[PDB]
Symmetry: D3
Subunit: 341 residues, 6 copies
């Protein structure tokens, strides 16, 4: 129980099933332990769950790499099988109920929910394979079955981790989803990159050039005259309502100049983020600026696929294992704007 989980956390960094106790006060949203003559705060509840339970779930993070939470949400994963994923930005669990982790939150392994199974847990593959409605995460292709191949990054202990020769946790995942004992077989999709304004590195020569070039030079170099990059990507700050700015790399490049404030009402990994943004020289502002983190070469691809001869169209692009809708507006053979709905 509680004292034992506190011991594990202090001694072994997290829950490992070791034995031993520490004294523990549970005080509103906080967990304290008596170390020597001092009471020391081990935990601070940002959950809707009883402070002692949240702390348990935390201590019982799964400490391995996995797909970013947005992907799981888009696959409609409800709950995990015999493990629990900690979202560090939120300081909470993915979901609210659990299976074979914590008695208080455990629910019977049943069963209309989309259960998420991971190959690194003992015989979860066999279990997944017997389960009507489920998701499977695997570091390796499984036979022949239809498979959503993951992107070139993954989530590990709070950080985003990029695929490469030297990585010691798995980054490239193979995802499987069965709906009524039948495997799902979606159309290939593009991926967002889970970068932020604190942690942004470019991924192509286009992105490198974008972050360093004058806007007029960049546009001219890549034949983007007709694609409204100044409104849509670079963003427009001369007006009372702040214009465009729907691609992250543009938001990143902009904030790095020091004159931007943003709030995000609904925080956490997601295919689309919405910001409440103010430019602090012009006072240009927008209450909902919807932004997406596509690789810029990828974003450009999508635009150049558009029929510019049509005034208004709902564009529908497979991303992060769903369909994302953009509005596209055009006039006189040019993009006026392009944004997420």
């Amino acid at each position: 129980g509680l004292e034992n989980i506190a011991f594990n956390v202090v001694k072994q960094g997290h829950f490992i099933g070791v034995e031993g106790e520490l004294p523990v006060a549970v005080v509103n949203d906080k967990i304290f332990t008596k170390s020597g003559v001092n009471d020391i705060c081990m935990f601070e509840n940002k959950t809707t769950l009883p402070t002692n339970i949240a702390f348990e779930l935390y201590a019982k993070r799964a400490v391995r790499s996995h797909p970013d939470f947005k992907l799981l949400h888009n696959l409609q994963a409800d709950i995990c099988y015999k493990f629990v994923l900690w979202d560090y930005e939120r300081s909470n669990i993915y979901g609210t109920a659990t299976i074979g982790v914590c008695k208080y939150t455990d629910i019977d392994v049943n069963s209309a929910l989309n259960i998420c199974f991971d190959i690194r847990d003992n015989c979860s593959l066999e279990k997944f394979m017997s389960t009507p409605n489920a998701i499977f995460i695997s570091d390796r292709k499984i036979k022949k079955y239809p498979c959503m191949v993951g992107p070139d990054y993954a989530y590990f202990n709070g950080a985003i981790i990029r695929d490469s020769d030297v990585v010691k946790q798995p980054v490239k995942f193979y995802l499987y989803k069965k709906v009524n004992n039948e495997f799902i077989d979606p159309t290939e999709c593009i991926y967002t990159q889970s970068r932020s304004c604190s942690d942004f590195l470019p991924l192509s020569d286009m992105e490198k050039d974008f972050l360093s070039f004058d806007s007029d030079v960049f546009i001219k170099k890549y034949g983007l005259e007709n694609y409204a990059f100044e409104h849509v990507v670079y963003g427009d700050f001369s007006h009372t309502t702040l214009g465009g700015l729907h691609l992250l790399i543009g938001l990143y490049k902009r904030q790095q100049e020091g004159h931007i404030i943003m709030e995000e009402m609904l925080k956490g990994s997601s295919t689309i983020h919405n910001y409440f943004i103010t430019e602090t020289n012009t006072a240009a502002f927008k209450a909902v600026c919807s932004v997406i983190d596509l690789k810029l070469d990828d974003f450009v691809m999508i635009l150049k696929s558009q029929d510019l001869g049509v005034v208004s169209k709902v564009v529908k692009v497979p991303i992060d294992l769903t369909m994302i809708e953009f509005m596209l507006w055009c006039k006189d053979g040019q993009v006026q704007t392009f944004y997420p709905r």
Copy 2:
């Protein structure tokens, strides 16, 4: 540990060291446990201690009779040795630290406080014998050391329990105190009786007559004409400020007539109790009406020991193992008033 304590409480009624776990939530001031499909509340913290600890001390409460708290307080007992005492009216523990009971609240035995030891704990006698400043409680005379002999009642699981041939927990306690490794010699002493307005039973013929007789018939039967019983005991409710009423039997008799509201600002076993009393016919009230529950015969004895000559006098009485002081005001060879301070 927490869930093990929950298991003992549910399965065994209190803590007895049996093995087992139940799932537990700690939610602010409360403790819940999963039982079938429900979350049931098992505890309501009224302590200044962390809910999970207050619950543990509760479960570890000592299930045995003991001298009433006010005696412990008056012998200046600071803490108990290897047990803990639950006060059911307050829903708290006697004191705040503990010894050999709960790791979080245990202080080291060594210090110069008055530690209270009990014969029912193996080896506490001998420990008490090798401790300079301490209190000892026992069901039996120990050799011939100087001994305070307690009253004909004791506290058990929230109730007052009276001495008799049928009682199966001890009620007569032999109480020892040491200071500088030297026993204190008892001052012979009167005892308050720990009754209340809900649980009150007369203890002598005088007390019985008191509860049933017209006031004029009683005063004259017992020769109290010069002792202001009307004011002091019966109470005077004819004035804007409630007169007298300093003896509990008089307060009980009174309020059982249904026309009294009381408010006790500071609750708990005590030789003196202070009430904020109002009478609902006359609107007579007193913010601080000090009240002692003496055997009425004993209260009468004290008054008849006193010089009705002196106008004013602090009278010193040995009661409940301390000295208790009253003011006595007189005029023309009679008592005007008599009250504690």
Copy 3:
């Protein structure tokens, strides 16, 4: 200051400005004080105010009789001048702001609310006289200004107190109201009686007979054959929805037979009370049973004033210093039902 207030409450029963300090903890909704070796709870916040403030207003409560809250509410008294009134059922104060009582909740006297002043506070009369929109309460007629004369009862320290030669706080209040520096002229008025199912005493011969007589014997003794007393007063518990029962004496009589459960959603002194009532033999229930506690004679008088000709009618009655409306439904020259709205 906090610890000084604690000192007054403990030593003096309430706040009277005496000097002294006690140690105090503020723990969520509670106040504790060190006393000997224990932490004793002195207060339980049931307010929307910070615990330490709610405790202060409590201690500063005015210890005197006053008109019952529903009268203050019906004269639209927003705040009190240099005193504060404790409601013991709610364990809160009347209103939310204060004047000249506690620095944290004091608003400036100047504003256009109805300030309630009291004769027992030095200089409040004259202040009331130089204030345009206000209410004045006093124990005595003031010269000959237009005056509402209160009922034969009042509130004191949580109790209802009845007028008599023995009462030592005032009960008969003379109540003044000013609007635009102009006195309002009283409408003669009936008064509800502030009784309840725990504390209920008959007030007339009719009320006594009511509580003891078979229903058929009473209806006929007082000529109520055409007034549906069975439905309206006695109550009908033969149907799935509890019929009638709109007068408190009828509800009291009923529930004292032991087969009634009530739930009052919104508690506190009020001319009308709404109950969620269930009868435990018949399972008859009504989610909203509106109830007035009129002297039964007064309720009878009103009915006998009415035209049994009209099928439906909103009847307007001056009560408790406001206008109170009832529906009266009739059929074939008799009352079907009669209730407040």
Copy 4:
């Protein structure tokens, strides 16, 4: 929405879908509403749920009779369909999730739990008919399916309600269970009676005699000489540990003599209740005294069915729709003791 729910509760007694808003504060465990110049408390959360939600489920409580909770628990009812059941003793709901009642706590109907459906909800029958694992409650036999017929009482708005010609909610429930889309065949069964020490009414001639007769006169009237009624039913309070007392009528009879303190660690409707009991003359106590409230005639029937030959035996009895086990210890052709486990 919150303020609309507040409006229904205040104006309509509970939630019925009427339109309107009231201002509401959510303060820790409490709900307040502005009414005139005051903040009135409308709710006290005793749940593990967010205060504003607990309040909603409360307001949406189903206002109708139903089988007592312990029956639902014993049929293993996990959740209700399109209604929610309030437990007034606990001030909580039956279970923790909900279906078609509150958006925050609604889970999808699809899953393999036992969903409890009710005839009084339009279309619940047919839904129950197309659901594999479920429980059905109704006021009327449904065709001829296998049917458990409930007892002569039921729960309504906090009370126990008895069958009779005058009852205006149903009391006799016909109860169905399906597992694998297959009805379960009822085992004939005895019922506990859901009485308590505050609300207890005898149900047979034997029960009446029991409550009034000297013990020796009763034992002999009903031929119980070989059945240890003294120990088992009357209770033995002569020893340090309270002997027997396993039947509620015996506990009631006893405690109404005023010399008993009980503490129930785990509260709520249940076929077996466990008490921590103390007798205040003899100080006899038992931390875990298991108690069943059977019709006394039924308890007698069971004992007279048993072999007084065997020294020890687990006896299995169908009660409250489950199997209930007792130990029966015998010696020299008589009962020593008999208790639940």
Copy 5:
């Protein structure tokens, strides 16, 4: 209500009167919403107001530019008319009551308070013009009336915004204050600049030189030999008590060197801030270092107006629409020190 405000915030960035609901838990100081399968924290109360209300007020920020809060405080603005201002540093409202914004906090528009009206709200100008005691904020001069012209900056969504050709919110405000239906006409004042140690840009050539020059060169360049700039502006760190340092630009220049820790006990926009400062090389420290953010050319002006022939004088300067007092000490024709009282 609450669910609708949550919807607005998620969908539209803030409250805009749109329609729709989201499920919402209110859990102590936090607001969560159910998004997909996760509970997501939308709000964290740093207010004294009920968590649901604070969140309402927030969602109902006025999202436009306005004068910094210090100016409103100095004008003694009590409350705002039909809008509410969010202080982002504090995470609270300006004030505690509201008008025409939130039912729970709304108070009648009356009325001894200094009500603050803004021209961008419909007919607030007409309202202000009819109101006895009020403040008016306007982006344009209003006729002829005496007018406090604002500084060259303003507060917008958490940031300070400087006046210029390109600004899209109003920065230059014209402020009006009536006290008894009479317009106030103060002496021209100077302004503080609302800069901090995180966000500091200079505003003159003097300030540029100050941030980059050796101290001896700067003083010599501007003839400040006799004005104690080393003590007063640069600050002195060689002594046990930390010397001078009362001008922000000096505090800024100093901290930027990396060896300064500061606490501020009473946070928020203000004409004078007080810091608890420690220099981490010398351990020089001061418990109350009072600092003011005057434009340095402005600060210098003030000093050079002083009669240096006088030992001690209370200097009185109009700033931020009040009078600020400085102590000035001189000896031998030089400033020893200059600081705020």
Copy 6:
């Protein structure tokens, strides 16, 4: 009391015994004060102590330099005499009880605890000299008595402060510890340096070279070939478990390259810290990486004292006034690894 402490804090920066009050709300974990028309947050409880008390203790920080908390912990200081030390990282007191500081937490000056006395308090030297079990902190040597000389740094108002010609608080302390009226006389020890990854400056030429050189050059320059510096100090990130990295300067140099995340479960000054570390390129990770902040020349000294001819040894080094144990593993005349247990 509380209002006075609030006044002191606002007016004078901290508690100084001055007189005056401010209004104050105590609201859960927060303290607010009414300043003008706003409620302003003065305090946020991270303690286990009642919010009003924690705030008192804080306001009553001792505002002077002192030895880092790790040293006091290693000397087993229990409590301080007439002062209280604030740990700013934790936002808590050293310890939980107090002496002559705050009535609520004050315990009698007695007495088996190791009481800590400081020379800067009046006659604490005389008191210490009369006390059986105690610690003494002094800015100067006291006669002849055995003395632990402090390191070349100290803790002051939240920062670490280095000894030097210019320091105005004492940095070099002389520490004394008596156990039974007998002075303790330990073997000279080495010291850790209380640096962090936020605040790190080197202290020798070796440390300067370490922070700037290629690893192969540094090792070659200092003849560290046989001491496994690459594993132990620089750390190894090519493996699934993150290798070595037990010296802070190595952790510092590493994190400064931008690819490291760390959690610390048990925060606060300590001789050994444990981190939960992830390298964000390789995903190399360790759940408990134990780190020590020795001066690198000092760490090297210790290694070069080791017999490399032995496979496994518990090395025992006097540090920070205790003994710290390291594991040392060797093979083929080389260190494989060296770490704290």
